[PDB]
Design a protein around this nucleic acid. Structure first.
Ligand code: DTP
Ligand code: CA
Ligand code: K
Length: 425
DNA sequence: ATTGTGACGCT
DNA sequence: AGCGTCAC
């Protein structure tokens, strides 16, 4: 009743750069704009691996993690841009720098949590209060929400329906109540329209966004209307929305845990979780997961938007699949050097830009025929930004994995160097 | 022969 | 600490 908290205390947005690496390449090369096109890493094995796909190309069935030769079968006019190669591996610097452009604009409007290179959560609660007090009672015009969908409306041409739903929502709004969660979300959506307009004006990049009361709903909302649109998911919209939502679509339930929720409880949709007590869910999935599931099938989640615009780790990884697996000492040392040199370059830039120094080096490897994605993960001290020293230390840390009697066996299928544990500098 | 990231939880 | 999960 009156004491049941409804998770309506915050306004949270999730901003997601539409096919980001593709947009970066389309900005640089106008011949790629408004065409079916994709970004690929490497080129020899089956044309290279596709890692990003424009919406025009998605219409032909082109997806990430598909070989370029196969994508060309689906879409023979597909245009491709290749990731830069430096020191023998893919180098994502162009995309990291573009991401910083976007994140810096978002940070003007509100505090952000960098979730990935192309995704950030936005805490809008204080921004909405400020904008509400600046309104002082006037309603919100549809003209302030030109790309917003209201999930679940209209009820009772795609752009025509978008506007019908928005009109239903806005006519229903009680603007006089400065504490109405639905009003707060709507003002959040106005601010996100402005943020998205600023991103596009100042970078050329388009994005989609979700606006709701927490991060999981904001992420779910963001996915409902792409590309270049934003979606408001109100608390009231959750029962219908969840009633036919596959559990795997909710952030963190797309893996083994979600599969076990489905198998153990015999359900398919998020909304079905409401039938179970909190103790029942904790009994199947643990105290933390159980309480989380109990609240989140009701639209409630408390995970904060962390004030963190920079990555916490700086990592350099390369797979050596099939017959490219590393089999000699000279090879392992040469690739550790290559990785360590990219890492030193990025670390020196990070120290200059962000006033911090990493203090721990994580070295990880995969060994041929090992079922796990990482076979070994050991850490050593990171005391100066020197590629030769880091590569020597990584070798020293992994060298007892060699079971030979100048050869390396079993062959190595992945090397990974990661700088972690930053401290202010 | 999805690769190259990056965040967080468990024990 | 090292390993596992999840997503991007
Ligand atoms: N597995 C991956 N390997 C390499 N890069 C990836 C991988 N997954 C995603 N990315 C890269 C390419 C994307 O441009 C960028 C953002 O990822 P993601 O948001 O999932 O898709 P996207 O931005 O390309 O399209 P959209 O969000 O519009 O559906 O990160
Ligand atoms: Ca994206
Ligand atoms: K993303």
């Amino acid at each position: 009743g009156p004491h049941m908290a409804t998770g309506q205390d915050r306004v949270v947005a999730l901003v997601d750069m539409d096919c980001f690496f593709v947009q970066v390449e389309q900005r640089q090369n106008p011949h790629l704009r408004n065409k079916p096109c994709a970004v690929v890493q490497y080129k020899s094995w089956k044309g290279g691996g596709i890692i990003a796909v424009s919406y025009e190309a998605r219409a032909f069935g082109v997806t990430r993690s598909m070989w370029a030769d196969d994508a060309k079968k689906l879409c023979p006019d597909l245009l491709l841009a290749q990731v830069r190669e430096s020191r023998g591996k893919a180098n994502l610097t162009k995309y990291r720098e573009a991401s910083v452009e976007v994140m810096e604009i978002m940070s003007r409007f509100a505090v952000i949590e960098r979730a990935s290179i192309d995704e950030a959560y936005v805490d809008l609660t204080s921004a909405v209060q400020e904008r509400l007090q600046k309104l002082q009672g006037q309603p919100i015009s549809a003209d302030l929400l030109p790309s917003t969908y209201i999930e679940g409306l209209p009820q009772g041409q795609k752009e025509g329906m978008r506007k019908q739903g928005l009109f239903q929502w806005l006519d229903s709004l009680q603007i006089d109540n400065l504490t109405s969660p639905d009003l707060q979300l709507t003002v959040g959506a106005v601010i996100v329209e402005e943020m998205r307009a600023a991103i596009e004006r100042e970078t050329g990049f388009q994005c989609s966004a979700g606006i709701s009361h927490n991060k999981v709903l904001a992420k779910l909302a963001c996915g409902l209307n792409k590309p270049n649109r934003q979606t408001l998911v109100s608390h009231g919209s959750v029962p219908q929305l969840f009633s036919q939502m596959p559990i795997r679509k909710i952030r963190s339930l797309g893996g083994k845990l979600g599969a076990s929720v489905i198998e153990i409880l015999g359900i398919e949709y998020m909304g079905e979780l409401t039938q179970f007590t909190e103790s029942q869910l904790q009994s199947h999935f643990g105290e933390k997961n159980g309480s989380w599931l109990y609240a989140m099938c009701r639209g409630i989640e408390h995970d904060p938007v962390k004030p963190r615009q920079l990555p916490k780790t700086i990592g350099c990884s390369k797979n050596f699949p099939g017959k490219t697996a590393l089999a000699t000492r000279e090879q392992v040392q040469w690739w550790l050097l290559q990785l360590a040199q990219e890492l030193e370059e990025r670390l020196t830039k990070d120290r200059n830009d962000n006033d911090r120094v990493a203090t721990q080096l994580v070295v990880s490897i995969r060994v041929q025929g090992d079922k796990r994605l990482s076979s070994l993960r050991r850490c050593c001290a990171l005391t100066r930004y020197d590629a030769h020293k880091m590569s020597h230390d990584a070798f020293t840390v992994i060298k007892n994995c060699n079971t030979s009697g100048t050869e390396w066996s079993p062959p190595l299928t992945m090397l990974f160097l990661c700088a972690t544990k930053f401290s202010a500098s």
